[PDB]
Design an enzyme around this catalytic site. Structure first.
Site, PDB file in Angstrom:
ATOM      1  N   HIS A  16      26.036  -1.568 -46.338  1.00  0.00           N
ATOM      2  CA  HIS A  16      27.247  -0.879 -46.119  1.00  0.00           C
ATOM      3  C   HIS A  16      28.235  -1.317 -45.064  1.00  0.00           C
ATOM      4  O   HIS A  16      27.650  -1.768 -43.779  1.00  0.00           O
ATOM      5  CB  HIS A  16      26.681   0.668 -45.600  1.00  0.00           C
ATOM      6  CG  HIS A  16      26.251   1.332 -46.871  1.00  0.00           C
ATOM      7  ND1 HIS A  16      24.747   1.374 -47.283  1.00  0.00           N
ATOM      8  CD2 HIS A  16      26.869   2.401 -47.793  1.00  0.00           C
ATOM      9  CE1 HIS A  16      24.719   2.061 -48.393  1.00  0.00           C
ATOM     10  NE2 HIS A  16      25.778   2.749 -48.558  1.00  0.00           N
ATOM     11  N   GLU A  31      42.403   9.738 -36.809  1.00  0.00           N
ATOM     12  CA  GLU A  31      43.122  10.895 -37.648  1.00  0.00           C
ATOM     13  C   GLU A  31      44.550  10.798 -37.984  1.00  0.00           C
ATOM     14  O   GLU A  31      44.920  11.455 -38.844  1.00  0.00           O
ATOM     15  CB  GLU A  31      42.768  11.983 -36.747  1.00  0.00           C
ATOM     16  CG  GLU A  31      43.547  12.691 -35.743  1.00  0.00           C
ATOM     17  CD  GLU A  31      43.334  13.867 -35.624  1.00  0.00           C
ATOM     18  OE1 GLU A  31      42.899  15.065 -36.264  1.00  0.00           O
ATOM     19  OE2 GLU A  31      43.806  14.402 -34.157  1.00  0.00           O
ATOM     20  N   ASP A  45      38.917  -9.840 -44.917  1.00  0.00           N
ATOM     21  CA  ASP A  45      40.027  -9.038 -45.557  1.00  0.00           C
ATOM     22  C   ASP A  45      40.158  -9.500 -46.933  1.00  0.00           C
ATOM     23  O   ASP A  45      40.562  -8.946 -47.842  1.00  0.00           O
ATOM     24  CB  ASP A  45      41.528  -9.392 -44.826  1.00  0.00           C
ATOM     25  CG  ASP A  45      41.450  -8.952 -43.468  1.00  0.00           C
ATOM     26  OD1 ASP A  45      40.599  -8.153 -42.853  1.00  0.00           O
ATOM     27  OD2 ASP A  45      42.374  -9.341 -42.541  1.00  0.00           O
ATOM     28  N   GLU A  66      44.745   1.654 -48.109  1.00  0.00           N
ATOM     29  CA  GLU A  66      43.714   0.755 -48.116  1.00  0.00           C
ATOM     30  C   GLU A  66      42.719   1.228 -46.842  1.00  0.00           C
ATOM     31  O   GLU A  66      43.167   1.347 -45.776  1.00  0.00           O
ATOM     32  CB  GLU A  66      44.377  -0.529 -47.677  1.00  0.00           C
ATOM     33  CG  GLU A  66      43.197  -1.667 -47.483  1.00  0.00           C
ATOM     34  CD  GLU A  66      44.066  -3.176 -47.238  1.00  0.00           C
ATOM     35  OE1 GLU A  66      45.056  -3.260 -46.961  1.00  0.00           O
ATOM     36  OE2 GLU A  66      43.157  -4.135 -47.341  1.00  0.00           O
TER      37      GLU A  66
END
Length: 332
Positions: A269, A121, A20, A112
């Site tokens: 990634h 969703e 984080d 964020e």
């Protein structure tokens, strides 16, 4: 010797905290580099991360920030606002964006982009719902989402699924024959998405890209995401599945900045995954592999992935259907 772990519980408590730090880190840089999109502006920070992006909005010079969040996390934010002397600049409002009320329209909506905004969703809906507060001239952070996909060959990855099933379902099990479940077990192993580091040389075509623009996205656009594809194969051999990577970007007035780690040459990634086909496809270099990925929100708070694929020259067809709720991390 190779091990499979649940991706969501893999990291230690310290590792999760360090992660984080690093990521909020790249958000702060992005907000600061685009300080012009925040200077003297009205900002709406939508939920979770304990209001921390609001502090970056303030650092960058925002006039006023509404931070909207669930009441537990909201009290911690309210504590932070006070002890950082930002009571004149950050207003913490407890609740959901849909049932809450703001005394004015905003220039920018921020959120964020952790994994559990991107694959849930409920979080995406709220993010979209918050546009009701956005000025016609307004902006969003993040602004867009990319999905990249590419076919891969990986024999070892595919055959491991069989060796797991063989090991457990062929020998008798405390005197009980389990072999009749072997096929069902193999089929289930194939539906486990896999998170891994792998060396791009296993990719068999240039990636195809699909962009979601949150600024232009309507009510319900993220429920079902259709990605058609046509890969022009650069290498011959067996295609064992598709590799996926996910990225968000802030398109500021100054600088488009990618927020899941960025492109200029080959690096890493944060959000990637490989999904196997039940049956591999043979393709020659120069052949085309076409089909479609459907990402649909499921009853369990993530997305299912449907992948269908065909080698055009030959008619050969394979497919699979996976839940992204519990990827496994493959440790080598």
């Amino acid at each position: 010797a190779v091990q499979y772990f649940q991706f969501y519980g893999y990291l230690s408590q310290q590792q999760n905290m360090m992660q984080d730090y690093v990521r909020t880190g790249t958000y702060q840089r992005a907000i600061l580099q685009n300080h012009t999109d925040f200077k003297d502006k009205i900002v709406l920070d939508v939920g979770c991360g304990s209001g921390i992006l609001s502090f970056f909005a303030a650092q960058a010079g925002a006039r006023k920030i509404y931070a909207v969040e669930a009441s537990t996390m909201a009290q911690h934010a309210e504590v932070l606002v006070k002890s950082n002397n930002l009571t004149d600049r950050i207003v913490v409002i407890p609740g959901k964006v849909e049932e809450v009320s703001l005394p004015e329209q905003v220039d920018i909506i921020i959120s964020e982009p952790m994994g559990y905004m991107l694959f849930n969703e409920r979080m995406l809906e709220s993010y979209l719902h918050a546009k009701k507060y956005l000025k016609p001239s307004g902006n969003m952070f993040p602004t867009i989402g990319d999905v990249h996909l590419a076919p891969f060959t990986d024999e070892q990855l595919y055959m491991e699924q069989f060796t797991k099933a063989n090991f457990w379902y062929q020998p008798s099990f405390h005197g009980v024959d389990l072999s009749a479940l072997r096929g069902a077990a193999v089929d289930e192993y194939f539906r486990q998405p896999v998170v891994d580091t792998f060396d791009i040389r296993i990719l068999m075509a240039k990636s195809v890209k699909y962009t979601v623009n949150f600024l232009e996205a309507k009510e319900g656009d993220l429920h079902r995401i259709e990605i058609p594809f046509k890969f022009h194969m650069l290498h011959s051999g067996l295609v064992h599945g598709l590799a996926f990577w996910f990225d968000v970007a802030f398109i500021g007035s100054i600088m488009t900045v990618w927020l899941s780690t960025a492109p200029t040459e080959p690096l890493t990634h944060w959000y990637q995954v490989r999904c196997l086909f039940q049956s591999p496809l043979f393709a020659k270099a120069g052949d085309t592999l076409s089909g479609t990925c459907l990402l649909i929100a499921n009853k369990r708070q993530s997305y299912d992935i449907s992948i269908v694929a065909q080698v055009d020259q030959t008619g050969s067809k394979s497919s699979n259907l996976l839940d992204l709720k519990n990827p496994f991390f493959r440790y080598t």
